[PDB]
Structure 1
Amino acid sequence: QMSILEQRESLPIYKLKEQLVQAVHDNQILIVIGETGSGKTTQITQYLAEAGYTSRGKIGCTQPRRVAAMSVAKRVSEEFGCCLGQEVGYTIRFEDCTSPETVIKYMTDGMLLRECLIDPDLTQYAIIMLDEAHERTIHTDVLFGLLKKTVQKRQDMKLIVTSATLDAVKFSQYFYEAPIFTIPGRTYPVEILYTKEPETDYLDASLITVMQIHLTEPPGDILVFLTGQEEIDTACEILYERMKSLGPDVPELIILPVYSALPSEMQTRIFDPAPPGSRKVVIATNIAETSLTIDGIYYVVDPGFVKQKVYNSKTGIDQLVVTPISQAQAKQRAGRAGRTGPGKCYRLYTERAYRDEMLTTNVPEIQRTNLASTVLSLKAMGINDLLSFDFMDAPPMETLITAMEQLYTLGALDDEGLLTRLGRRMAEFPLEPMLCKMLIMSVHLGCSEEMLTIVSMLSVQNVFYRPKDKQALADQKKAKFHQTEGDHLTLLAVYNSWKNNKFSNPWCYENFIQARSLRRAQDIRKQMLGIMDRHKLDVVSCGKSTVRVQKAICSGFFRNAAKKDPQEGYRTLIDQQVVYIHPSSALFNRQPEWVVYHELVLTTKEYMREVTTIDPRWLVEFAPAFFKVSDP
């Protein structure tokens, strides 16, 4: 098959096209409600560009995730009839696919937030579309407050807020009782199937269900909800092996992973219809709940888990953890099987577990995460009265205080809670405050050439290639890069030996390093170097004096200091928690007295990820505010 125009005119939103453009015309702020797949993200931009709003400025539309922003900009450029990056483009952290021609721009919420820092009145935009607002992320909640302020100054601007939920009433009341525009649409019955007893391994259960659906259920594609990439990559390998084990007579199952770090060629495959006699299985994360819309899906497999940030209010530390979904999310997952016809949802949990063991809705991200980055962004925009900031769902006053005192000990805020030269310099980088700090400190410590590489290597995933077939051999290849001082300097050694071997792809194959990842680090480095140069921050090498690198790391990650326990593992300096060096660490067979880790990862044990050896003396030297027992 059907032409792009026929596909576009088949969408539920098409029936309300003229009435939608008139509503935008008549109202400064409009709340748009419609079920997922009605065409809000992809058509609202196009309708208003056609109405002529692009003559006044850009039409910007936020997306919560990378794959969402890239996919919708690719589709909309095919529908618009242009090059991707020309009239229609996207902006993600470290990838700006826009140009002087761009009139429709899809960007992550974090990217629009970074634009507010530079231009608080968003004068470049005629229309701001806060999309997928029901997902309620820190960046979305921050953008509501910022745009509430913008709408007052910019009388010419148009603000469209979308929702796939009746949480539109809260958004309407928030935005001066703004009108609500409803896109009616057909929702079909979904047969919800629960397990009689819980499952030991939800991964196994998902695979068994997928094969049972594929072999015994009428045609329709399958959507599987998993928690991350490692888990998705594994599920795909086993499913492929298991399907191969059935023999050549068996009908084809097209196994399609979906996650943030996916090559764009892999991203387009998930939207192609299956050939006749074949079936698709899309193995995705919670991106597939609302952000991505795949046609032909009639079956959903739901293990009931999601990876989400949990916060400790006492210690001020947040962490990504695998927890059950809210009841609202279970309904969203099930609904994906009832978009184009009746479907089935296989819940890999009991009816009792749904009814009792599940929260109605989850707590907004702003009330279950560390606010240091948020507070730093707000202080950089001149927003010092944090109590005066109009949040839709206010974080606890204790959290805003915790966030303030952390930036203080970092040296971003002074005694009067105002930004310092450090804080200002830190705010110029799209990185988390502990990463900014160590980059700005490396300028003073004379190792910014090294820190630019380390910050970049830490901003990429999957640096080392470790196939399931060649695991022992991979580990032998990785050990050749192992530095006595730790993981951060091992990451610098990988990049420098790649650079010295003239950025060779065959060198990467030989050494089991992932060339795509080093090429991404090189790109991030080029961009970070650009900021240093604009702000005249000196780029100096430490030569062989790598202790300077260690001091710089410590100056930013002192909160993550740990001491070796004489019996088992390490005890964190902050809450005296038992933490462990992971078997993949350069320090695994040389565990020092004191370390600093990049992040904590919860698997079987609480593991420290990216560990560097420190002198405990540096804690007093680089974080003196962070101490008690200071007088007689």
Structure 2
Amino acid sequence: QMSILEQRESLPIYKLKEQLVQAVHDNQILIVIGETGSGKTTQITQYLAEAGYTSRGKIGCTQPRRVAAMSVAKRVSEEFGCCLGQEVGYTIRFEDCTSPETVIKYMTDGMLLRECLIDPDLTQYAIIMLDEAHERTIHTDVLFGLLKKTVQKRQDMKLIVTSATLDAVKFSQYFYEAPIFTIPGRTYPVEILYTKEPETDYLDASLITVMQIHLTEPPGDILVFLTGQEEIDTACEILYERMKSLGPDVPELIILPVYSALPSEMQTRIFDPAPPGSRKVVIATNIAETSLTIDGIYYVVDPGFVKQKVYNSKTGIDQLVVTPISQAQAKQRAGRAGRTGPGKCYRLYTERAYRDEMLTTNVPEIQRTNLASTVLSLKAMGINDLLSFDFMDAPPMETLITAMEQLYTLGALDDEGLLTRLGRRMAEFPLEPMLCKMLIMSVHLGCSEEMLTIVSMLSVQNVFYRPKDKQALADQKKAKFHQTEGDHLTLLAVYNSWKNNKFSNPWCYENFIQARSLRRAQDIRKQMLGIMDRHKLDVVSCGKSTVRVQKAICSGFFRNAAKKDPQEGYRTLIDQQVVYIHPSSALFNRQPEWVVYHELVLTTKEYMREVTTIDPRWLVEFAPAFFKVSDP
């Protein structure tokens, strides 16, 4: 109702409070099932803290995304009555908002995985809650295996797994036929509306649908499912313009973006109720399917797309791609319009496309991703017999062999498949293996000062400010930073000139650089420097000898080597695929014979992102294992 306490007592889980703490008391492992918004994430930790479980250790609860971990920790600290970071806190990659006071901790799946490396028995925890398998992430499958082992060694610890009705028995059977606790909940009818014919521009169709709902449908807030941040920011801008073009005699539409890189002040706005005579539209990614729960939503706009990872078994390369959602996802999206009353779901696709062009459920992430990082993490924990690891959704044998082969050519593993000194040092950093490799190699190549900066700059969102109205001016400002040897050295030049200008916000404004992004890289750099210092890895500058930087990049990213094609674009060394230097690259107007790129991004063309010029001789010098029978 009105107060926080009344709001907490109106949640479906409240009716089962006593029986829930009794079920936890009676069972070491409990599978918890309940409709999204029933209070599983926010209340279970509080119920158990009240029952006295924090006296024995921390209560940890995993979250799949940054915005979810931050959002729930903030809400739970308000309900608990403490400071965020004190009794209730959160941990995400590069941001640990916890203290010696923390008894309730929300963390990303990846952060719990990093704690297992330090302490495989998770001795600091009395309770571990593994919050769902919304989409069965690699981290969920890995944490299930690690905690099935932890539960055997630790008879005192409690394990709570939240689940979907369809997954509950599979999770139960996995956890030694663990009991299932069901939170009954009211689900309301959702009118499902399909398009008569397929829509070309799903972004335009979704904006048209939002405006039609707003002006002609009874009060209730709208939830739009888009594919990413850039798309979301674009949707918001166009909708704002379109709504303003209607003039002042039109009811207010509160346009609210939702993405994992969202500033916290904008995150709180999505939970605020709309004032009378106004309506809000929440433009979100698939975080809004199960992770974030907004009250007052009665309308869902479903264009039918998710950005997910697709793996190539032959090349061993994975890539983010926009594909249709599974039917299970369509059902989850529609269900968001039926939580507090009957609602409507506008599917921007035909009924035939739902029944024929959509998979029932998606393939689990562990079966369509590169597993080099997973294998490196597992080997760092002493798990050498990968065939013995009890996975719920088993990865293909080919993917595990490809992962081993990749780490071996990186120099992380030996012939027997055991970690080398290199692999061990690589495992100490919360980074992708090719990034770890170039950082440890920069120590031996005498450019770790530069590499700490480059790795930190590569770990942040675009630092170049490019407003739609000042695109030509933005490019001229950026061109001043352009280094002849590529994008990585341009990132280094941006950071160093910012440092040399005493980390000035006005300098950033003048040069069209995002100060927030540089402050994030600065913070990441300090944390990476902390790991280097702990493990006595020397921090050395190359000075003017930036060829050392290029070699270190090449020692990690040789797999992404590509040679300039005489006709157009480039051809990858690995599979002779046609790839291109992006128009935003420092190398766009000075395309060299050989390059290495950070990643491939599919837009209109298959574009290389973050390109550095290389000498092909360095491929033999830094990746000799990666080359079969040639002379020269």
TM beyond 0.5: yes
SS of structure 2 residue aligned to 1:323: strand
8 Å Cα contact 1:134/1:167 also seen in 2? no
SS of structure 1 residue aligned to 2:274: coil
SS of structure 2 residue aligned to 1:134: coil
Q: Distance in 2 between matches of 1:158 and 1:175?
A: 12
1:261 Cα offset (Å): 1.0
Aligned to 1:240: 240
8 Å Cα contact 1:594/1:616 also seen in 2? yes
Q: Evaluate the alpha carbon distance shift between residue 336 and residue 170 of structure 1 in structure 2; reply closer, same or farther with a 3 A threshold.
A: same
8 Å Cα contact 1:132/1:291 also seen in 2? no
Q: Distance in 2 between matches of 1:236 and 1:539?
A: 44
1:425 Cα offset (Å): 0.2
1:326 Cα offset (Å): 0.1
8 Å Cα contact 1:113/1:139 also seen in 2? yes
Q: Distance in 2 between matches of 1:568 and 1:467?
A: 30
Query: Deviations for 1:464-499, whole angstroms, at most 9, x for unmatched residues?
Result: 000011010000000000000000000000000000
Query: Deviations for 1:2-24, whole angstroms, at most 9, x for unmatched residues?
Result: 10000000000000000000000
Query: Deviations for 1:16-43, whole angstroms, at most 9, x for unmatched residues?
Result: 0000000000000000000000000000
8 Å Cα contact 1:252/1:278 also seen in 2? yes
Q: Distance in 1 between matches of 2:117 and 2:320?
A: 27
8 Å Cα contact 2:313/2:399 also seen in 1? yes
Query: Deviations for 1:319-344, whole angstroms, at most 9, x for unmatched residues?
Result: 00000000000000000000000000
Confirm whether residue 487 of structure 1 aligns to residue 476 of structure 2: no
Q: Percent identity of the aligned residues?
A: 100
Query: Deviations for 1:531-571, whole angstroms, at most 9, x for unmatched residues?
Result: 00000000000000000000000000000000000001000
Query: Deviations for 1:141-190, whole angstroms, at most 9, x for unmatched residues?
Result: 00000000000000000000001332110000000000000000000000
Query: Deviations for 1:223-275, whole angstroms, at most 9, x for unmatched residues?
Result: 00000000000000000000000010000000000001110000000000000
Q: Distance in 2 between matches of 1:361 and 1:485?
A: 45
1:630 Cα offset (Å): 5.6
Q: Evaluate the alpha carbon distance shift between residue 450 and residue 283 of structure 1 in structure 2; reply closer, same or farther with a 3 A threshold.
A: same
Q: Distance in 1 between matches of 2:132 and 2:486?
A: 41
Query: Deviations for 1:37-77, whole angstroms, at most 9, x for unmatched residues?
Result: 00000000000000000000000000000000000000000
8 Å Cα contact 1:310/1:319 also seen in 2? yes
8 Å Cα contact 1:448/1:539 also seen in 2? yes
1:611 Cα offset (Å): 0.2
8 Å Cα contact 1:256/1:281 also seen in 2? yes
Query: Deviations for 1:69-98, whole angstroms, at most 9, x for unmatched residues?
Result: 000000000000000000000000000000
1:628 Cα offset (Å): 1.1
Q: Distance in 1 between matches of 2:134 and 2:334?
A: 17
Q: Distance in 2 between matches of 1:460 and 1:259?
A: 15
Confirm whether residue 257 of structure 1 aligns to residue 241 of structure 2: no
Q: Distance in 2 between matches of 1:108 and 1:134?
A: 14
Q: Distance in 1 between matches of 2:371 and 2:46?
A: 36
SS of structure 2 residue aligned to 1:301: strand
8 Å Cα contact 2:305/2:324 also seen in 1? yes
Q: Evaluate the alpha carbon distance shift between residue 301 and residue 626 of structure 1 in structure 2; reply closer, same or farther with a 3 A threshold.
A: same
1:631 Cα offset (Å): 8.2
8 Å Cα contact 2:445/2:552 also seen in 1? yes
How many residues were matched structurally? 632
SS of structure 1 residue aligned to 2:337: coil
SS of structure 2 residue aligned to 1:117: helix
Aligned to 1:200: 200
Q: Distance in 2 between matches of 1:230 and 1:604?
A: 15
Q: Distance in 2 between matches of 1:420 and 1:294?
A: 48
8 Å Cα contact 2:309/2:368 also seen in 1? yes
8 Å Cα contact 2:134/2:290 also seen in 1? no
Query: Deviations for 1:290-314, whole angstroms, at most 9, x for unmatched residues?
Result: 0000000000000000000000001
8 Å Cα contact 1:129/1:161 also seen in 2? yes
1:134 Cα offset (Å): 3.5
Instruction: Mark the runs of 5 or more structure 2 residues left unpaired by the alignment.
Output: none
1:124 Cα offset (Å): 0.3
Query: Deviations for 1:334-389, whole angstroms, at most 9, x for unmatched residues?
Result: 00000000000000000000000000000000000000000000000000000000
Aligned to 2:368: 368
Q: Distance in 1 between matches of 2:447 and 2:302?
A: 48
Q: Evaluate the alpha carbon distance shift between residue 262 and residue 134 of structure 1 in structure 2; reply closer, same or farther with a 3 A threshold.
A: closer
Q: Distance in 2 between matches of 1:245 and 1:575?
A: 50
1:407 Cα offset (Å): 0.2
1:135 Cα offset (Å): 2.0
Q: Distance in 2 between matches of 1:480 and 1:163?
A: 52
8 Å Cα contact 1:33/1:166 also seen in 2? no
SS of structure 2 residue aligned to 1:182: strand
Q: Distance in 1 between matches of 2:17 and 2:136?
A: 27
1:111 Cα offset (Å): 0.2
